[PDB]
Amino acid sequence: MKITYCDALIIGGGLAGLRASIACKQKGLNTIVLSLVPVRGDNEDLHFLDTVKGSDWGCDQQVARMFVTTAPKAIRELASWGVPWTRITMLYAVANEALHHKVDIQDRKDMLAFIHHDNKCYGAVVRDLITGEISAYVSKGTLLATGGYGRVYKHTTNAVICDGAGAASALETGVAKLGNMEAVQFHPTALVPSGILMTDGGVLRDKFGRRFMPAYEPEKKELASRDVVSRRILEHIQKGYGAKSPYGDHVWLDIAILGRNHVEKNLRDVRDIAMTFAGIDPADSEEQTKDNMQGMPANEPEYGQAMAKQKGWIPIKPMQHYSMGGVRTNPKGETHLKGLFCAGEAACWDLHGFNRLGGNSVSEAVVAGMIIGDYFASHCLEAQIEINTQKVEAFIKESQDYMHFLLHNEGKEDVYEIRERMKEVMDEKVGVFREGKKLEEALKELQELYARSKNICVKNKVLHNNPELEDAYRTKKMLKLALCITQGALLRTESRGAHTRIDYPKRDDEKWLNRTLASWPSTEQDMPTIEYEELDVMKMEISPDFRGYGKKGNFIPHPKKEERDAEILKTILELEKLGKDRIEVQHALMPFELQEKYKARNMRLEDEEVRARGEHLYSFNVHDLLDQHNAN
């Protein structure tokens, strides 16, 4: 029974896990990263506003402030580690720094379960993917940084390891909780059929070549939020205006209208991806056919004229891309299980609410690794009572017994039939557009796949190097997430961000300004326990209002909205008349907590030019409330 002891244990070798591991070693911690793959701007007030609106007011606004205050420092730190700022190789630069700090990075170690006792986490029980050996890693603190759970869906951009096993492992402690599992982002420009993200100044076209987005979204067009553009693309396809293909209807991404040399220099990544997988050069504006133009409706001017198909158009359609939900943390990144932290897409921090802002893709995992990695490192420095060695061995023995059970039980169920059908149910009935009756059908079928999954038996009967064994214990975890995703979507009778209910189309800030909490405290539960956190409007820097894109007048106002808005407005006026700057006004509206070195003022090149034109004030960037005041 092999037990390895360390101070700081990190699960997940992506940007967030590796960046956090550097923060641990900077504090002198013995730090082990269990990786599953081997090693090879806008000013901050506007950034915050865009993040909050982008979340459809589902985010924790303090966390959004922590993020945007720290982001510019992530960019400066990355560039000092040699990232060319065009990629702002990021995983290489961060991996290289972690090895410079002598982080112990292991691969082919796969976590099966968290070690826990008395509501404290003491590490992980781990399976070796090659030898099948089960071992324990004992630690003062554990950080989960395993990404999202997109592989629960059938169509996903996510890599294969993004199945949410880590989140499920936290769920199965009975103590950690999952937040907003129903908040699943479907990204509009996934390549058909690979699912490679094609995300930039291009335009979308239907089968006839029409620029349809401006009619759906006048203010923002193709640059509406990702949850909005995905819904519009599916509305337009539903009308029958998609391009037929062997993989279903899709629309076109026209990057060729920006000219060949713009595409080849400023967008070489997309050009290389299109040619290698789709056999398409997206810089080529040359006409492929006029046939597509035929048959265009003559009464739909708002979609404009029909353009002739060009060889360089990319076939795209919405697919699952990002998991807003995840393991629920406080702002420091600690879960309800003391000593278990979680950072990045694996968490519900909650930075993103019901839709991740497209601009926060680049920096999110590094920033999370900085902030939470540092809070995580501080926790690991504190003295704590140890767990008895016997308790550890019993966690090891439990996973050993579980492996034998998966190989040798009387069940006749095949892991792949169950997994395939789960992914289909999620894609058809828990996707972009959801409906009560249909969510009910999904849950029932998921319920019975879950009962059948208890009878899964691995046909390949070896303990070592066995992909079917891995898939069995991953799929059994995935079905619990699927039940959490679906029950939360069913309960939430509103439309917020990426969660759209056809039967409840309005955003409800009176009754659903909250966060879904799923837990699993009992082994004998076959369904999650559901709770909520109510969000406190009176502590919001910006009260919930209109997003600026998508459906207009589509929210039920929170009862206290007007009282908070008058309080916000009086605060801005009083302090700005007294000469207070944007930092002091922000702090009066909504204190937030962040380490000194990350809350430090971000200097900007044009600071002197903004203050000289007298546009450095809080009200210059956050002014919706002030416009209605100065109107009267």
- Please measure the distance between the N-terminal and C-terminal CA atoms of the chain and give it in whole angstroms: 74
Nearest CA-CA partner of 98 in 184, 35, 183, 164:
35
The values of phi and psi at residue 17, to 5°, are -70, -45
- Structural domains in the chain plus CATH codes: 3-184+322-388 (3.50.50.60), 186-319 (3.90.700.10), 396-529 (1.20.58.100), 556-631 (3.10.20)
| Dihedral sign (CA 71, 76, 80, 84) | positive
> Cα 77 from chain centroid?
23
Those residues whose C-beta lies under 8 Å from the C-beta of residue 346, and which sit 6 or more positions away, are 12, 16, 144, 145, 146, 147, 148, 164, 166, 167, 323, 326, 327
Nearest CA-CA partner of 16 in 381, 479, 351:
351
Angstrom distance (rounded) from CA 20 to CA 10: 8
Angstrom distance (rounded) from CA 507 to CA 523: 35
What letter represents residue 291's amino acid?
D
The values of phi and psi at residue 455, to 5°, are -100, 20
Q: Which two tokens stand for residue 157?
A: 């951009």
Cα separations in angstroms, 142 against 7, 347, 376, 554: 9, 14, 8, 42
Nearest CA-CA partner of 483 in 513, 439, 515, 514:
439
Nearest CA-CA partner of 33 in 119, 91, 117, 116:
91
The 3-state DSSP composition of the chain as helix, strand, coil percent (nearest 5) reads 40, 20, 40
Angstrom distance (rounded) from CA 343 to CA 329: 9
Angstrom distance (rounded) from CA 419 to CA 423: 6
Number of Cβ atoms within 10 Å of the Cβ of 552? 10
What DSSP string describes 168-205?
Answer: HHHHTTTSS-EE-TT-EEEEEEEETTT--B-----EEE
Angstrom distance (rounded) from CA 482 to CA 422: 8
Angstrom distance (rounded) from CA 392 to CA 398: 10
Alpha helices for 226-354 (secondary structure H): 226-236, 260-266, 268-273
Go through 73-89 and write b for each residue having 16 or more CB atoms within 10 A of its CB, e for each that does not. Answer: bbbebbeeeebeeeebe
Those residues whose C-beta lies under 8 Å from the C-beta of residue 201, and which sit 6 or more positions away, are 255, 258
For β-strands 314-323 and 184-191, DSSP reports them as antiparallel
363 burial type by CB count under 10 A (0-12 exposed, 13-18 middle, 19+ buried): buried
CB-facing half-sphere around the CA of 171: CA atoms within 13 A = 32
Determination method here? X-ray
Residues 65, 226, 231, 232: which is the catalytic one?
Answer: 226
Based on the residue annotation, tell me whether 226 is a catalytic residue of this protein: yes
